[PDB]
Amino acid sequence: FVNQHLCGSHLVEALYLVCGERGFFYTPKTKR
């Protein structure tokens, strides 16, 4: 698949587009 890297707010923005209408977890670890 695609050779892209994302860090900080750029990784949050990609997760917001893929998941922000369902909800998501951006914390380094959680109870999942």
Partner: peptide, 22 residues
């Protein structure tokens, strides 16, 4: 977790869906 997986290696939309609610 989530913050290292695309910063230290590569990710796609199918890998971002791992961090979705569920």
């Amino acid at each position: 977790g989530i913050v290292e997986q695309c910063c230290t290696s590569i990710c796609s939309l199918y890998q971002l869906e791992n961090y979705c609610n569920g």
